Amino acid sequence: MRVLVSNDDGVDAPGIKILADALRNAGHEVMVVAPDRDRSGASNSLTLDTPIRAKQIDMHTYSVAGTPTDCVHLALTGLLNYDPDIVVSGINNTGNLGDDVIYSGTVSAAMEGRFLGLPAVAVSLVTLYQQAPQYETAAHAAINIVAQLKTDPLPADTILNVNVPDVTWQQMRGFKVTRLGNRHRSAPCLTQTDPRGHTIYWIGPAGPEQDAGPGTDFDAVRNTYISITPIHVDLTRYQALENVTRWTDRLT
Amino acid sequence: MRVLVSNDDGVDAPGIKILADALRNAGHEVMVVAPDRDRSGASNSLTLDTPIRAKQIDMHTYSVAGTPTDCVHLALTGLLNYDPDIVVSGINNTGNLGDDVIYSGTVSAAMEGRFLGLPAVAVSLVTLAPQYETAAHAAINIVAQLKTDPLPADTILNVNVPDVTWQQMRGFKVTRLGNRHRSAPCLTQTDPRGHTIYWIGPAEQDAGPGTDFDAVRNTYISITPIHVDLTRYQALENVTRWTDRLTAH
Amino acid sequence: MRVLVSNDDGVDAPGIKILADALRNAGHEVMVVAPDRDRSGASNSLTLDTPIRAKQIDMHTYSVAGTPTDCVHLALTGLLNYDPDIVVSGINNTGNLGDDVIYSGTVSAAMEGRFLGLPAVAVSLVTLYQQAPQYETAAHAAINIVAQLKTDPLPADTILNVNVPDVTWQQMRGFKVTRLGNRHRSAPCLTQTDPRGHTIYWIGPAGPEQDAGPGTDFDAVRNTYISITPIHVDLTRYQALENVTRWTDRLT
Amino acid sequence: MRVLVSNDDGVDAPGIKILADALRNAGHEVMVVAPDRDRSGASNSLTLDTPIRAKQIDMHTYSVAGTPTDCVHLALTGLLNYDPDIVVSGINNTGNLGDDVIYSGTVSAAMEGRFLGLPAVAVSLVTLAPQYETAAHAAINIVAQLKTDPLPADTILNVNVPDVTWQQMRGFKVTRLGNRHRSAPCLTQTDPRGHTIYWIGPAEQDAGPGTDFDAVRNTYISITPIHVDLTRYQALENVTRWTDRLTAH
Ligand SMILES: [Cl-]
Ligand SMILES: [Cl-]
Ligand SMILES: [Cl-]
Ligand SMILES: [Cl-]
Ligand SMILES: [Mn+2]
Ligand SMILES: [Mn+2]
Ligand SMILES: [Mn+2]
Ligand SMILES: [Mn+2]
């Protein structure tokens, strides 16, 4: 019904506009609070030391000079007289798979969605390489997810990290629940030289042994399956608390 | 043992130097690979699109023009002929508690430590005369304790140290992550130009008993074992049924 | 005839697209090489230490992961088999007046245009404050400037810093040649406090005595005149070389 | 005299400390207002949208969380009860020659010095053991020479120092700005992933006699008097006729 929409690529990004329109046409009351620019490369932390400017484009659309987390946080703490029951973050220009999820700005917005007691979904479009972006397919996926969460909503302890293959909806195989992978386990750092002659290092590409087998988000988007990874909102490993306590007591 | 040391505040930070010296004096073979500048404010992602420069300062001291994750990753993938069994990240100038942990650059380095199959520890000094020696003294005991009984290779330790002397610590407390910005109401002021600016509200929240907030508040060195895999495996069972019912229509 | 177009706000900016279309419809062969994101806040220097990625959107449009100067420089040094006789930089989302010109990324692209021996124009849209951007007016101004430079081109020693009032073309008074101003001469630093209690400083607003009188770019855009400031491409003050030399000899 | 000192490399930079000490020992009342971090890579514009924090380190030493222009601007508009007659910016870790001057953060601080009605000097050390003492020794002579015969209040001095000892300098040379990237052809290589990346070509250009490039090349401390007003007043005469002919149709 009521959806708060944000992203990483900025408010002028085509990914979020198509998503907002798709949700508008789906009968959902949208609410866009997005960064002023593509802040992919800056921290995702809440801006606490400095105040944040929030210019409004039009109704239901606010531009925010700050991190995606700042967007969502402000949007739910006084910036808006709006009470959404779900936060949809996206649609990101690229994909968010494996280790790229923890530091993802798109995911960080959704991460801020749960911290304030709201179900959240991070939607990304796995694009590589001439071609045309399929944000409509990713949006069409989103409008079905939000609708399915209306009937029987998933537990208030996780968010959905959704990644969409950059293709058409007919070519799309379907949906699969996947776990996060690990692309750069055996990434062998290559050493080349700049024109100046100094030594520069490249982070190695996907090695022979990489965590991208079946059941991982990498595999799903590889075989044209819209990946859905339920990820933690609490980094605390509660199943390790029992062991570390004994370890700490022997150290205390 | 062999210890790889990194941070967030940069290689010229006093937090990492005191830590490296403390580990040196503790009989551990240290190895410092740290950012060139304080990159608190930039992304923590691995730099893939551009190559990374790595200037060496001295014996086992490397300045890296890139993220803390780039430091650790390179240091274990060819930059060094060094095989450490533990990665100690710190000591950060500030603290890393609750929601500030997921986006922490200090923690991100340690996070990169486990991804390559190495136990990792993020050490921070909760400051608001920085007592880095106390945080370092805590670290040298943790790494030593991991020699006998090492961590299970599935989690890293997020350690935060109260900015005081060692004679004021009442011990260590295993805690979880808190959430101070639960329902923190934002405030609205104006700039000298009059344009409307928004402040993120100050500290209803999660900072009670068992939290790392309450830990470092009572002068206890907080130790939070955190996930290295964001995947909520205990939710995979339910989402699958939810997804199958969605696939139908 | 042949125009190279760049900006500061990124390749996905509406300012550059409308400009490119206006130049396309004007019978000019356009060529867009723009940053991948809004790099307003990063340095304008040429990226020398690291290599630059240049993804192509479509023909005549290349996205560049680097500074506006990197865009123009590469576009004229091998990235393209294209030989434009003019470099139009814009249209920037904001204005570039007075001291904001030296550090302007939009102007920096045009600045790179002259360094390689090409006439260059920086076009900006003075926007303040609900409202609708008038990029079309700024573009309509640009297509007349480029056309006028076809007949009798301005000398190859300067570039044009053009700023357009955010209004319609009919409301527009006309064009005026102006000099750069100085908004923050007597800007009195105000001192307030953050919620935490620490002391923060605000850079003072336009004081009573500010260089924005008649003949300055500020005044033109104030009275709905499209400002045109011919600015230096060589920072060297050649009229001071005669004095400093005597001063240096007395020091040598 | 009263000297306001700033830089680009940050307040913890060795370049500015040696400069400040040299000016202190020269009998000048110094005043250091420098960025908190090395902001080479960020914009030089005045921070207007957000407020600026200014932590004080010691007596006449202020760390500013903002651009070099923010440092100088604040330092002359209320942050300090200090009225210097000259602003010395440096000493930058690298050199500032030709087209690298307009976007230089070191120069931007000095540029902010003139905008508020104060003579300003940008001092850089052309490095490719950093000889900051030589660059500082050059600076203390320049500021002293400006006491007797001050600069005309319309330009600032862009000073660049060869990274050598003082016993190797053949003197000072007043030069102009060069242009090494005139027609430098870019090169095309590939990343390990195979995707096409572009390198900006190395040094037909402008670095001959009279240029600051050729100056610091022959171990001469280059002094380039640069504009503070980008307006080309000698072009105002022609553009006006060009604009009037454009206004007609
Ligand atoms: Cl992202
Ligand atoms: Cl941190
Ligand atoms: Cl700009
Ligand atoms: Cl510089
Ligand atoms: Mn993004
Ligand atoms: Mn830090
Ligand atoms: Mn811009
Ligand atoms: Mn510098």
DSSP D16-71: HHHHHHHHHHTT-EEEEEEESS--BTB--S---SS-EEEEEEETTEEEESS-HHHH
Distance B28 CA to ligand 4 centre (A): 40
Sequence-distant (6+) residues with CB within 8 A of A22 are A136, A139, A140, A142, A143
D77 to chain C nearest CA, in Å?
5
Q: Quick check: B198 and A252 CB within 8 A?
A: no
Cα dist from D151 to B61, C241, D1, whole Å: 45, 11, 15
Report residue D169: phi and psi, to 5°. -75, 130
Strand ordering across the sheet containing C174-177: C174-177, C225-232, C158-165, C120-126, C86-92, C3-6, C32-35, C61-64, C52-58, D196-199, D187-190
B8 annotated ligand-binding residue = yes
Distance C241 CA to ligand 4 centre (A): 23
Q: Cβ contacts (< 8 Å) between C152 and chain D: which residues? A: 242, 245
D171 to chain B nearest CA, in Å?
33
Residues in chain B that come right before a backbone break, where C and next N are over 2.5 Å apart: 128, 203
Residue pair A229/A161 in contact (Cβ under 8 Å)? The answer is yes
Which ligand ends up closest to the CA of B13? 6
Q: Cβ contacts (< 8 Å) between A132 and chain C: which residues? A: none
Of the candidates C162, C157, C118, the residue with the CA atom closest to the CA atom of residue C142: C162
Q: Quick check: D103 and C174 CB within 8 A?
A: no
Nearest to A247 among B108, B149, B177 (CB): B149
Q: Cβ contacts (< 8 Å) between B202 and chain C: which residues? A: 195-196
| The two structure tokens encoding residue C235 | 């920072």
Q: Quick check: D177 and C101 CB within 8 A?
A: no
Beta bridge partners of A52: B198
Distance C92 CA to ligand 3 centre (A): 6
> Which of B49, B188, B190 best probes binding to C when mutated, by most C CB atoms within 10 angstroms?
B49
Range list of H helices, D149-234: 212-217
Nearest C-alpha in D relative to A47: D50
Residue pair C70/C52 in contact (Cβ under 8 Å)? The answer is yes
Strand ordering across the sheet containing B221-227: A190-193, A199-202, B52-58, B61-64, B29-35, B2-6, B86-92, B120-126, B155-162, B221-227, B172-174
A62 to chain C nearest CA, in Å?
11
| The two structure tokens encoding residue A130 | 């001439």
Distance C107 CA to ligand 7 centre (A): 10
Buried b (16+ CB within 10 A) or exposed e, A51-75: bbbbeeeeebbbbbbbbbbbbbbbb
Report residue B64: phi and psi, to 5°. -115, 125
Q: What is the resolution of this structure in A?
A: 2.8
Q: Quick check: C51 and B53 CB within 8 A?
A: no
Q: Quick check: D191 and A202 CB within 8 A?
A: yes
Q: Cβ contacts (< 8 Å) between A40 and chain B: which residues? A: 43
Beta bridge partners of A33: A62
Q: Are strands A190-193 and A199-202 parallel, antiparallel or unpaired?
A: antiparallel
Q: Quick check: A204 and D193 CB within 8 A?
A: no
Helix and strand element counts for chain A (H, E): 6, 11
Q: What is the full DSSP assignment across C182-218? A: BS-SS---EEEE-TTS-EEEEPP---SS-B-STTBHH
Q: Cβ contacts (< 8 Å) between D207 and chain C: which residues? A: none
| The two structure tokens encoding residue A23 | 């949700």
Q: Cβ contacts (< 8 Å) between C121 and chain D: which residues? A: none
B40 annotated ligand-binding residue = yes
Residue pair C178/C216 in contact (Cβ under 8 Å)? The answer is yes
Nearest to C177 among D46, D181, D243 (CB): D243
> Which of C16, C37, C52 best probes binding to A when mutated, by most A CB atoms within 10 angstroms?
C37
Distance A17 CA to ligand 7 centre (A): 21
Distance C79 CA to ligand 2 centre (A): 39
> Which of C93, C234, C242, C246 best probes binding to D when mutated, by most D CB atoms within 10 angstroms?
C234
How far is B68 from B90, CA to CA, in rounded Å? 10
B38 annotated ligand-binding residue = no
Report which DSSP code applies to A235. Answer: -
Q: Cβ contacts (< 8 Å) between D49 and chain C: which residues? A: none
Q: Quick check: D202 and A190 CB within 8 A?
A: no
Of the candidates D177, D30, D35, D151, the residue with the CA atom closest to the CA atom of residue D96: D177
Burial class (CB in 10 A: 0-12, 13-18, 19+), D127: middle
Beta bridge partners of C52: D198
Distance C90 CA to ligand 3 centre (A): 9
Angle at A172 between CA A171 and CA A174, to 5 degrees: 145
Cα dist from C204 to B160, C100, D46, D110, D112, whole Å: 40, 15, 11, 19, 15
Interface of B with C (CB under 8 A): 49-51, 53, 187, 191-193, 199, 201-202
Angle at which helices C14-25 and C135-151 pack, to 10 degrees? Answer: 40
| The two structure tokens encoding residue A76 | 């739910």
Q: Residues of C annotated in the binding site, as ranges?
A: 8-9, 40, 92
Helix H or strand E segment including C157: none
Distance B117 CA to ligand 5 centre (A): 28
Q: Residues of D annotated in the binding site for a divalent metal cation, as ranges?
A: 8-9, 40, 92
Long-range contact pairs involving B179-183 (C-beta distance under 8 Å, separation at least 24): B179/A115, B179/B98, B179/B99, B179/B205, B179/B206, B179/B207, B180/B97, B180/B98, B180/B99, B180/B205, B180/B206, B180/B207, B180/B213, B181/A46, B181/A73, B181/A115, B181/B99, B181/B205, B182/A115, B182/A116, B182/A117, B182/B206, B183/A77, B183/A116
HEC string for chain B: CEEEEECCCCCCCHHHHHHHHHHHHCCCEEEEEEECCCCECECCCCCCCCCEEEEEEECCEEEECCCHHHHHHHHCCCCCCCCCCEEEEEEECCCCCHHHCCCCHHHHHHHHHHHCCCCEEEEEEECCCCCHHHHHHHHHHHHHHHHHCCCCCCEEEEEEEECCCHHHCCCEEECECCECCCCCCCEEEECCCCCEEEECCCCCCECCCCEHHHHHHCCCEEEEEEECCCECCCCHHHHHHHHHHHHHC
How far is C161 from C174, CA to CA, in rounded Å? 16
Q: Residues of A annotated in the binding site for a divalent metal cation, as ranges?
A: 8-9, 40, 92
Residue pair B90/B107 in contact (Cβ under 8 Å)? The answer is no
How far is B180 from B237, CA to CA, in rounded Å? 30
Nearest to A189 among B74, B171, B242 (CB): B74
Of the candidates D62, C162, A62, the residue with the CA atom closest to the CA atom of residue B198: A62
Q: Which domains does chain A have, with CATH numbers?
A: 1-252 (3.40.1210.10)
Helix H or strand E segment including D175: none
Report residue A250: phi and psi, to 5°. -75, -10
How far is A72 from A76, CA to CA, in rounded Å? 6
Q: Quick check: B53 and C49 CB within 8 A?
A: yes
Nearest to A177 among B116, B176, B236 (CB): B236
How far is B67 from B71, CA to CA, in rounded Å? 6
Burial class (CB in 10 A: 0-12, 13-18, 19+), B201: middle
> Which of D70, D174, D183 best probes binding to C when mutated, by most C CB atoms within 10 angstroms?
D174
| The two structure tokens encoding residue D182 | 């005139």
Q: Quick check: C46 and D173 CB within 8 A?
A: no
Q: Residues of C annotated in the binding site for a divalent metal cation, as ranges?
A: 8-9, 40, 92
Beta bridge partners of C88: C5, C121
Report residue D181: phi and psi, to 5°. -95, 55
D60 to chain C nearest CA, in Å?
18
Nearest to B116 among A47, A145, A185 (CB): A185
SS3 D82: coil
Q: Quick check: C37 and A37 CB within 8 A?
A: yes
Distance A143 CA to ligand 4 centre (A): 50
Nearest to B12 among D12, D51, D193 (CB): D12
